[PDB]
Amino acid sequence: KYMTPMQQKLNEVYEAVKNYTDKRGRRLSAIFLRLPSRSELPDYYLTIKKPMDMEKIRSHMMANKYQDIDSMVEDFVMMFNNACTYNEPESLIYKDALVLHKVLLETRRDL
Ligand SMILES: O=c1nc2n(c3ccccc13)CC[C@@H]2CN1CCCCC1
């Protein structure tokens, strides 16, 4: 029922990305939390090879499967690239992926 020190440090890097807010308090995390089902957006699953969202990321961290931080980063990094593939470069999701990308990386250097 407990959480390894590595788990507690993956939760921290996870939570900072989720809770990041822009200059007038919007949470960029919102659109990325969870994808609509295959039945509700087949185009996404037919155009993006390996679909990723944050609660799916959450289910492996809280459950067990990340050996270090950069292991979790690559599913985050992967998720963003998916968003930036499916959405056009000037789209909002696209830039929020970009901004959150740096947050993830700004957080990890802080160890
Ligand atoms: O790449 C992604 N793209 C989208 N979501 C995501 C949610 C979690 C992870 C990736 C993505 C939310 C759906 C959304 C894209 N959005 C779908 C409706 C039409 C406008 C674009």
- What is the C-alpha radius of gyration for the chain, rounded to an integer number of angstroms? 14
For residue 4, report the distance from its CA to the centre of ligand 1, in Å.
32
Tokens of 102: 């740096």
Q: Which domains does the chain have, with CATH numbers?
A: 1-111 (1.20.920.10)
- Header resolution in angstroms: 2.3
Instruction: Give the CB-side neighbour count of residue 7, counting CA atoms within 13 A.
Output: 12
User: Among 38, 44, 46, which residue has the most ligand 1 atoms within 8 Å of its CB, making it the best to mutate?
Assistant: 44
Tokens of 100: 């959150």
Q: How far apart are CA 93 and CA 21, in angstroms?
A: 14
Backbone angles phi, psi at 21, to 5 degrees: -125, 145
Contact yes or no for 20/28 (Cβ under 8 A): yes
Tokens of 62: 């809280």
User: Among 79, 86, 100, which residue has the most ligand 1 atoms within 8 Å of its CB, making it the best to mutate?
Assistant: 86
Q: Which residue has the tokens 């740096």?
A: 102
Q: What experiment produced this structure?
A: X-ray
